A paper describes a structure:
The African swine fever virus (ASFV) type II topoisomerase (Topo II), pP1192R, is the only known Topo II expressed by mammalian viruses and is essential for ASFV replication in the host cytoplasm. In ASFV, a functional viral Topo II pP1192R has been identified, encoded by a viral gene conserved in ASFV strains, P1192R. pP1192R is detectable at an intermediate to late stage of ASFV infection, mainly within the cytoplasmic virus factory, and has been confirmed to be important for ASFV replication. Topo IIAs exhibit a 2-fold symmetry and comprise two functional domains: an ATPase domain and a DNA binding/cleavage domain. The mechanism of enzymatic action involves the opening and closing of three gate-like dimeric interfaces, which are called the N-, DNA- and C-gate, respectively, upon ATP binding and hydrolysis and DNA cleavage that introduces a double-strand break in the DNA (G-segment) trapped in the DNA-gate for transport of another DNA strand (T-segment).
Author numbering:
A (entry chain B), B (entry chain A): 416 to 471, 502 to 654, 658 to 1193
Write the structure that this text describes.
Amino acid sequence: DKYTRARNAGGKKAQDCMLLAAEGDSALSLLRAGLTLGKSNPSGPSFDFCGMISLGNKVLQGIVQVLGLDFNCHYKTQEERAKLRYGCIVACVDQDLDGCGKILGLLLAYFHLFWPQLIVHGFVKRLLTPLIRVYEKGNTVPVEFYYEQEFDAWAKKQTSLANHTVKYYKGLAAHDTHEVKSMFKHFDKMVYTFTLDDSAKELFHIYFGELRKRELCTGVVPLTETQTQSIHSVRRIPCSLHLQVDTKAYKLDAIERQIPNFLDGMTRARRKILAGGLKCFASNNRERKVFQFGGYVADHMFYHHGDMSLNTSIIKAAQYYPGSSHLYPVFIGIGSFGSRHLGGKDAGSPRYISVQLASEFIKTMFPTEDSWLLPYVFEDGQRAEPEYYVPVLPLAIMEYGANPSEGWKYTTWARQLEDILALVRAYVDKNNPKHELLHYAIDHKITVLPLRPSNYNFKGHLKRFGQYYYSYGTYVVSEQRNMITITELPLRVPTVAYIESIKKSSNRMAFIEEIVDYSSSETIEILVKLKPNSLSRIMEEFKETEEQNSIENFLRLRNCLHSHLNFVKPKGGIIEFNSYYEILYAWLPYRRDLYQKRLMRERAVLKLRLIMETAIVRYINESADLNLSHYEDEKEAGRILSEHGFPPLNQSLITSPEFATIEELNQKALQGCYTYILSLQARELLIAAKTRRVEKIKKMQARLDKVEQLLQESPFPGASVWLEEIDAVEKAIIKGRNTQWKFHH
Amino acid sequence: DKYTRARNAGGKKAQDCMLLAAEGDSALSLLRAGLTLGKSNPSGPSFDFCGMISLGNKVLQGIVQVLGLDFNCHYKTQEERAKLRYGCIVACVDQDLDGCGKILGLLLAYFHLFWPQLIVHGFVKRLLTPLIRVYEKGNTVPVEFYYEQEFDAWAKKQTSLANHTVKYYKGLAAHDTHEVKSMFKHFDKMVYTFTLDDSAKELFHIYFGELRKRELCTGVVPLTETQTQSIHSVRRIPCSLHLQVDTKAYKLDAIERQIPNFLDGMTRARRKILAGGLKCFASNNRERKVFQFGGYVADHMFYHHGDMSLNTSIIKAAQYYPGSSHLYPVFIGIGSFGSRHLGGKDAGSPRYISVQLASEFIKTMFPTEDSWLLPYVFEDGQRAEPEYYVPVLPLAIMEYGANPSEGWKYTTWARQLEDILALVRAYVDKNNPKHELLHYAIDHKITVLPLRPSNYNFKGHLKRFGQYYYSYGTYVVSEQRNMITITELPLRVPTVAYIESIKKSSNRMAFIEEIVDYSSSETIEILVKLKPNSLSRIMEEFKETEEQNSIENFLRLRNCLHSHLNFVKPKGGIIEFNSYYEILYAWLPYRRDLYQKRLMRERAVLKLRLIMETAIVRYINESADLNLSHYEDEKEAGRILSEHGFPPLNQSLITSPEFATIEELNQKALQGCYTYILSLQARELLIAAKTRRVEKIKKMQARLDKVEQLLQESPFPGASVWLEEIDAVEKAIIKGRNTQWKFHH
């Protein structure tokens, strides 16, 4: 049972021997390597007082068998604990959500449910391996932090990290051999005891029992430095904090994987996919195979999940057909990506079909200059997809989406594009008559403009009964041949799935004699021929109200547009909406603020670029008598340029204004060198390049004072820019819809 | 049963009906979209005279049910075939090898086995979609090729492919919607009938029956131009040609996924991984996670298989432990990559463990300047990993490799490194006392130097009896306790697997009280407690005369080293060897020819670089009197440069000597440009830069002279370079062995 027995286990020294419980054969091998250091690690842990077991049901039965525990005792007394085969059980798991949060919480919940006194007496402990290690170059010993807060506080204390390399160890298998030896040299210091708490009694029931959904509404709060210091002083971890942090983070990650945000209506994996598509196709928009693009996404943006899910999600993002999940797909899919039949799972293998970026729609929808201002999530210290995207339009409500969750449901039907455009234009125009009235609605929680479900690719009927919308397909009946030609199915209903649902009910085949599917790749045309004189029996069997018809109910030609508007908050946690209009009003302020954020960032980078380009053109003009050829090396030329009034500038930061904010920009750009003059190509010396430089200089000057003007726009800065972007994105949407979302045609 | 019944199927006009058989739901959807074009494609195929069936036993039973075929009947008469429900069956399969070889080949074999008269009568057909489509820029009508040979011939007929974009359609899902409509417009042309040949009867038994082994001994031969023209003109394809050129290729590719090429001892997947590692860690050797590197390999090296196999193969390449597959791993693995136990399958998760290139070993074992010359595998017109690597030492025999095979068996035990080094040094040195008779033995296929199995990480005994080697583990038995301590297991025997093998035998368990694994990470320490007075029973029961001791036979400590030397020929086909020196002799000429080719190309590149650098330094010395600021643009600047004697040079070619043969750059150096003078930065005009350029010019002139002298070397050109590379490889291997393949740690 993957158990290694210690020599002193079950003997008179049972109170001294420990039982390291690990998840996975890799963790078992690491524990074995650490324990078998032998004389190379004197006084360290070995199999004399340590046994190993694997957590990878019957596993807990084996654990209770080896430990000697019984279900008819509480182990409050000292003698009951002394009767155990081991002094303590130490969980040796990872530091990620799956390992540390899920496995450890499950084990702790099991122990608390069965023998809470063991946790009270600290019988169950954990192995707290270092999480972040900072290695200074020229040094062999690292600086170890067990939490992100300690690492970032230390980094704030530090002045620069150019001489330090930061390594994250989220799993037990990430430790190197010398690192494992270093950890096992001080093995006793890494053991942390678990103590029960008053709040933990209900926390265990919450996280492992309804009200858990209330608990997950708010985001995960990292432990403050005071709690970490208190834990490290005594090496005791209250299980309440572990449940509040690790288990909550694991559950929130699962929710984020299943439930999307409301700012962009799109999940973490999909955000990785879109960001990878933006990065890959920015330089050259060319067709790439689905598996190649998935490999690029996994390599560059830390998509560690299974490649099959990555390819499935890429195909889903590139799918465009009536009833598809995406009304405005971000990828143009060259090949066969499936159709409404089978619900889009009939796509080809990833190695045949190819994808490319919808350059026009993506550029008009997610501005390239706006990606720098978003908050980004960092995977093991490396930049990854943005925490959220803020499109020009509320993308969360203009596309369909269906997803089950752990007690939650995500169901969104796309709203009418015209209504959304009218609402946003009224909000931003300041000239539309309903602008002030829309603001009055926004700050008083009321609705002024309708928001109807979209029916772009739908050829049925959308009827509202009460507060619920229903989609109806279209059919024609020909009793002359005693058969029905279904021409339009209910919205978001797969063809073969509908046919098999019809064939499942034996009641309906009391009259049906044959069903065939002659539908095209886009339209639906299903020939269902019935038994003779079956029309009378269809009439008498099915009574329907004014909402349905006898044929409609007989063919199940009605679909109810249920809406479960549950999304995740931008800063963590989930929020449950009840209307699309409040989602729109919630999305608006982020876009409004990020517009002006981009505005001042553009102003600052424009000033810096203008200064550099003026210096460059001055150097080009004066290069005739400033021949660097007669001069010796780099430093002499830099000193001479300094003596000639040229300013030292960080051209790398300015010509490439990355995610660095305006304070970093104006504190680092002026602190540079003269590489911009020395990096000038010889082709820049001819007067044609100088004319190009000066005309572009006047262009950026015009852009600069126009940005100065726009920063004082009345409704909010950049309102006209928002209007122009709305017009561009609606033109791109119209162009895509005209050409079946196949551009370049 | 995923069958769309045709309107006239099974009727009076059933002879005009066809049954399109599609492999995959994507192919089914493509066929449906093509058929349902309706009025957009007048006089085209439709569901009136065409039905759709899915091929992806039970499906064969469905086909015979729908077609009305009778096993008893032979359909040798016109009326018997007229009784069928469909006129003919068309197999719609991908133009790849899986579909077409596995599917179409199996269908043809089944039909020939059961109803050969249908095949000889033309009842079985297929859909031959275009394989390559080349589009002229600015033209909406492409030009198509159904075979690669005709496309290659057309490319030879062409002059330049700059204005032509080539797309490969290896699968039905790769066709675009407009391409599908264009195909179904002339669908009548794309259907090809199958003809039965008397020689094809033998091939059917060969591929679907022992004769497979000496049928696959040679590589696949592509169809000649005349055969393709005859097939196209009459639209009939013989079964023998299809089996010889298509399903044989599928079988060969399936075998190649298991059996490695003897030139480098790595399969297609491992060669792709090595090429990706060389391409990724070339500029920067920073550690990358396993999943990130797998994504990079999939994106760049065209690894279209699943990510699980890719990660497993990367882990196998990075593993280093006693008994591991790779004695000289390609990648240094930071993290827990596995141990002797679990057969090394206890590696860490791919998202935790990291890999990096063993540059100090790889860069000399596989020279970077030699990868430019290897034949490269092209996937869909895009370059991929080379056909075979030619390492400095024969890697197919210095590392252990075992794998179950289909129709074959592959097992190879590593040879002693000292023996391999001595053999290669004798061959190349020209001064070794064993050089001449080794050359003689190469021609006479005899042995002049010993080649013993390696025992680097093995602490047991390598005993040869008859013609078979045996590995013996070391044990110690203590009678004062009546226990057995296994200190070393036989070569390449997993610890847990060995323990389970011992435990599953009841006779051995009759005497053993218990077994407990106390082994270290790389040291085996297995404790076996025996029942009382058992030693006499072991003495009398498991006694062996001379091959084993009684204890060794009882504990199964002897393992036979069966070497199945069956490798993949570099030009396709399987070649079987009888000894390792045969493999070495076969490998040597490839390395010698590669060295000669490298010398030739290096001399050419050095001449070109000398010319270019002389021009650059002449321009730099003459830059003060020739200022480009006064000049207008690049065209007249280049005109002035030509007037001043500067030659136009293709800078992108000389600076980056990519995968081009000597003739390629010899003919492309005639074309030139003046970008080399124009694109040099201002910092290059300094005196220090000019002096460095002059020193580099002198050094490269000396290197050119050295290469010219080396080209006339006596044993063969580059013998001294080969010896130096051998010494460097030996030093790198020794250094890695000292540091447990953890260079710089």
